[PDB]
Symmetry: D3
Amino acid sequence: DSYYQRSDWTADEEQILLGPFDYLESLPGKNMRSQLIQSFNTWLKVPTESLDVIIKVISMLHTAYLLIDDIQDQSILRRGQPVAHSIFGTAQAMNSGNYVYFLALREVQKLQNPKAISIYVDSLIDLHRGQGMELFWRDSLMCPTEEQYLDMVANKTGGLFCLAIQLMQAEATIQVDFIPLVRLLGIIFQICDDYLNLKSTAYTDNKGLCEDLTEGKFSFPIIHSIRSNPGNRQLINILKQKPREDDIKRYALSYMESTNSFEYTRGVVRKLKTEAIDTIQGLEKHGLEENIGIRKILARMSLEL
Amino acid sequence: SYYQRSDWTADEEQILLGPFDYLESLPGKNMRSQLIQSFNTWLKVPTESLDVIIKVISMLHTAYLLIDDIQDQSILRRGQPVAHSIFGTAQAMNSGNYVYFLALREVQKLQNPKAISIYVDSLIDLHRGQGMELFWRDSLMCPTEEQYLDMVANKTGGLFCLAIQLMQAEATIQVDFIPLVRLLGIIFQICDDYLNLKSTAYTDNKGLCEDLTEGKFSFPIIHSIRSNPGNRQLINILKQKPREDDIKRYALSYMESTNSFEYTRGVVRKLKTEAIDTIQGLEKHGLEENIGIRKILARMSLEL
Amino acid sequence: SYYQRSDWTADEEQILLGPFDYLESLPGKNMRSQLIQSFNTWLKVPTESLDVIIKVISMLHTAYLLIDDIQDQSILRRGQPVAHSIFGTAQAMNSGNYVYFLALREVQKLQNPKAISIYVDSLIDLHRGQGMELFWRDSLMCPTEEQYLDMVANKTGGLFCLAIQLMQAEATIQVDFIPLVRLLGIIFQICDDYLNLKSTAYTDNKGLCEDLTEGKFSFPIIHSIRSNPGNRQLINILKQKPREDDIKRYALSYMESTNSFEYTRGVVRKLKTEAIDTIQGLEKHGLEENIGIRKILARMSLEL
Amino acid sequence: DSYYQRSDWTADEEQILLGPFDYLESLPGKNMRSQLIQSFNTWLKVPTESLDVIIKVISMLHTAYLLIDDIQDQSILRRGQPVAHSIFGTAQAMNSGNYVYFLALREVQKLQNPKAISIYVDSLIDLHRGQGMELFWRDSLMCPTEEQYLDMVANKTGGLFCLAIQLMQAEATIQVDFIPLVRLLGIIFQICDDYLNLKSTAYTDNKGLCEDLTEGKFSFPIIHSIRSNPGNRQLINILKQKPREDDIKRYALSYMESTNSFEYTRGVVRKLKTEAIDTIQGLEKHGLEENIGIRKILARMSLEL
Amino acid sequence: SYYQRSDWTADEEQILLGPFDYLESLPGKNMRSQLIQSFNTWLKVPTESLDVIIKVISMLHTAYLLIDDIQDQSILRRGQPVAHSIFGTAQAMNSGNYVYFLALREVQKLQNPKAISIYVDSLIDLHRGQGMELFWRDSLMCPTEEQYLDMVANKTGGLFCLAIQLMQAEATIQVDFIPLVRLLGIIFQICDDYLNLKSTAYTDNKGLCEDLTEGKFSFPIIHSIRSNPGNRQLINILKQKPREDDIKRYALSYMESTNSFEYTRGVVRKLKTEAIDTIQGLEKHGLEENIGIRKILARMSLEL
Amino acid sequence: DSYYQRSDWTADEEQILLGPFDYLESLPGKNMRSQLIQSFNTWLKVPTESLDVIIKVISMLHTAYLLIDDIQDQSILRRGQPVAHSIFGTAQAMNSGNYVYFLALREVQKLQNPKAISIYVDSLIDLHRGQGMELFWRDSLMCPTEEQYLDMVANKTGGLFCLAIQLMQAEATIQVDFIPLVRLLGIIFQICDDYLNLKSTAYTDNKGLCEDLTEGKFSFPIIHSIRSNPGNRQLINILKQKPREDDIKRYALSYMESTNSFEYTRGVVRKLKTEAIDTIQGLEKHGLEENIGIRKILARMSLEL
């Protein structure tokens, strides 16, 4: 007899809701995320059923982060194709991404681990605190110290690597602590990504020529370069202007060589990879079998450094 | 070691919560605070649990408003600038999402496992609400009025239904208030749709006829566009997004000529009836008489 | 056959005529309706033909306004939004042109062949009017006042001269009213140029001093710029196209300091004289006294 | 003694009025319009004097339509050069084009046929009803069915082909009906043009890379592709955004192959050309001499299909 | 010869000086005219020299205003449009700079060589004033209040210090008024900073709270931002450059809650004290009592 | 005891003030300005100490003019790199440039000549009257006559060439008058620059493809071309639109050939170089030694004409 009779969710409607998310999963991609899980599973040996739920959760949370990273940054290309919101609009894309956050949270509930929810929130909370500080610096025009940048990347990479490995740990019968190691793989990953954005014919095709400058981000070398001579304000002022122009991007890229900021970056990645390899050997000299996979993942992720 | 991990300092939390702490220092309605206090007359959650439910709802509330004003591209919010006009869409969006998960770290404090599924399922239905509202907005499809109401059931289901579902989850009473509270959410949304165009308390707060500037197929607007399809003026006006008052004013006039405002007042009437019967429905079945919920039902249709 | 041709449905005609049907549901002057009724006192066209002439003039009228508001980029029109702000320049332009030819399919109904040449020649002179107005606007050449008046003769010749020429073409009287009606068109244009800046009935309708926002070398503006060439303020103000009222206001002040408004009032006076003599001119020569045309001549200079 | 003495139109002034029209006639061009008249005149044999007035009228009405098409569409190139209004301004160009409509109408009056005026209005009225429906769809974002699109192109091509052939018929001593045939040549012309806009190095040079997407137009394959999978809304949403960007245009062009919409388009043009050739043979098996010219015009107009 | 050089005609000088002659036909304060007349009570420059000093100061004055309204992107100036909104930043900038050097060709008329070094050194310090104001504006560094005051000493040193230094250079009295006049320049700047936000005579002239739209770290704004760094609202509001009044209004409210306006009034008080003591300081040392300078000191803090 | 204690200017602050000026001096450049001083010093033989102050003054006044030319014009490239204000903002760059005007004026005071100040003002005043008339024409859309343009360039080049040579004269013990000659070298310089902007692969790399059209400037051939056929208004209307688009710039460049405006320009430069060489020979047939340097500077400055 009711005026309003409540109706069910149709598959047709979910097709709309996931429009921008589905679109992005159609674009060919790195799947670096999967080689890291595969390599850490050589030690944790998470049961196939649980590991598949962990893998779909991370697959989702990944593409959802891109949806919202590319809005917050205003990128123009994503994996060489148009960004999702340049097709669906900032509005529909940022709501697809937010939606997936909770479909992932529904998926995590399938592991029926009681610590799974606390792990998820504590990873997601970490993430938003990384992008919290990053935006604050970017928006306030005050460049962070290299230490601050790193602390910020520990949180940021706390929402994928740390979340996936913590979830695998929570499902594995062993209680080695891998999080300090994976946090370091994250830091090595981002500093590399920051370098490749400014110096790679593979990355000027996929994201854009020096796409980090267009968005204003204080990336790892951009920091070192602004600080190295601070009486020069050419570099920080270029970040302010947020240039889509390429002559400006080229000049900034060239000032950054003249501060030898790309050597600097390359030798820190050298120092951090030594810490990784020694940390892995530490894990193996205590009971864990030789991991070829994760040494190869580490060589892969520095291959242009 | 090259990298020594740092602890999250209280000044950084201040930065993250900046947009959020702003929207909270603005004065608002808190009709939701009395919606909880009325339902708590029947459910009787202890004040230790009720406060957690109340902090969750007030966070999740201010978190949507952070994001909704970006999605809508609102110009104002409770008379004052939208938070993202001070901090930038970038920081507002992030601060908004950050809360979503602090609200979750807060829900776990109830230590109730039925609570985590109630939060996922509520947040999921909220996004299928906005998802379909934005889809019509952007495609310029006009939904049917049944279609609009289903979408409102989900949106008015990530706050109203969340709060009452978490209360039902901390009480032992086996009685479903979810229909009543969802019907209340819809009556609330339909009034917010009318008052957008028709209240000098709402035009002094969100701007003149802001549902037009946003392109939203709101309840009266749907009625007016569908009441005469040969006139494609109102829908064309929604496609342009008019910050100009002389268009907004003209559109409000067209919607009068289609008795969309009489029509709207009339659905709300027919609905409050269903509401005050469903209330007496639960009262006949063992519950004490709830004066307060009757008063919420009539403060939330006080115009019209 | 793959393609079976369809018939033009009445709902599609509704779409085409959308912008047009809008500008017509807005209230207007219809000084042109009384301009026809006054001249019909002398010409005495039967109401069967007069109605066709009247439908043609009211269509061609609303069709220019559709297009003129795009060319000028007007913001308002008779108090209400320009049609193209609801439908988009694209649809408004097309709907405007579409009428131009429906007005022609209407002219053929008189079944008068002198009528088709009167319509071509009128529409041609209208476009040489706007053509030269836009040319000065864009080049920032300021026309001489003789130059401005020649251009107005053509523009005020695709409506006034059209309507009277079609009436003269359905009457047997061999007397030329075209000079009188063209002089009337110019007196009308010059007043519309003054009232743009000086009427609270015209600022409440087209916006404050809208001839400035449009860059138009209007009659008083020409006088003021040419009255002192060492001051390039007024012309520079036309180059910027000021939606800002504080510039518009400043410019209106400058034009007072140059007695462009006294000057303008004075041309209109001198012209109405020529008009009311040319009227008595045709009356001495066999025509009955026309009270109504005297009243149009003075309603159309009622300010000043 | 008069205050205002009325002055004549100078050649100098007409030079201004026709600025955008004259400009466009200076750009080298297809003159496909003239091979169609030439080929249909093999049957109608319109007297040279009349045919020259018909030819100048169509020459004018053509360039005038471009003036206003390129404003309504906001094209950036026209026959490889800048659009007229990118030189003279939307205002001066749309008034030049409107002006020519009536100079053509003055020219038609030179044939001193009484049916010439009714033909002209009935063609022009048809035209504006084609662009009427096209804009309405484009502006309302609701994609037409293939049948609707075609009915719309029957009107659109009713203002050049149909007008020129009807005018020739009205001047010829024979009363064969050629309009059903020419209407079909029009439909074949537009569907081809729609295809070439998205798939031709000759058309990405002359109009722009996928210039139809920039303007949002529901062109013949863009329709078929939106409808073929309607749970995907990537294509229609690209039309909404009206991208000038090329990566977006490339993605849309590529989605359209994956719906096999270019085969679809190519095989309809095949089916319609069969109807043409059979209609021509119908006209010849009834008294008309073999028309090589119009078979060659038809092969020419599909040469990339 | 192909090229025969031409002479600079008086109509061309009219063009160059167009923006300049405009800002001069607008009515202004001329507190600087009475600042000179007060100091001339002690210095007694002959009216033949005083007039040259006065023409230099009134040119250099109107020349900064031409350029400052471009650098700030002011919308208004003394109630009326900024000169560059009529002529374009291009012509305004150039006309502004042109004067800078006509002011110099005017200084040489004093035939005093100490005068040319006083003009260079004054103009140099003006640019180190604006240079550092713009640097903070753009970098979003907030200066310390000592930092702000040093910058004001230079800016209020290319007009105040210029005028008095040129007067001291045409008088034989060996007494330094430069400290007093610089202190007066700062008291003047601090009041202009308060009145921007707090005067209906200043909001009716430059627009509501125009120091916000310009992003300027002005004296009260510095105090408010630095009085609470955990709240990044006011500084974020400066980063956006708000032409919207509802943000400007909100920011003005925040600055009340930080007693930046009480604080500001209090620095001015403490300063006028230093001023009226330094005045009595020079008077004890052989100078006649200067009523007029006491009155300037109190007209230039008449609000507060 | 004072509330405000006044503080000194630090080197740190001057580094900020000169940010845009220092930036521009870092970009590799022509230093044509120095070959002209060097060649005229073969006759004037200005003492090394004075000549160095004259040379630093002109070095400064030069880079300062660029700071403000590139704002007033809204250039996008300067010597092939980004314009200064595209890095520091119209505001900070136009104040750096204005600042340098007076640091130069401080430098001129080091020659301790009493006529040095009057020379400086009279040069700077001339300059601003050249850019005064140029902007007025550009902004008012009314094209100057070739004579007007030239008078305007006599002032414009009165603020570098004339200033540097007048300063050298004021320091030299001889009183030959070189200003009529140098004024003519200026005119030859600008007409050449105007030509090269529209027709040079060296100048389409350094400033931009036909950068003069983007800014609307009535340059020497653009004048001749607008006037040559004045019933065509295509060219002047392109200046109005201020096109950054390249197809528009190409069309305008091509209309300018069809008016044979580049021959015209090239043969005036021929006629003016004859006046130069005959004026120099005049100076030498009166007491001055053969100047190879200034003949080579003149051949250099027409090398593409």
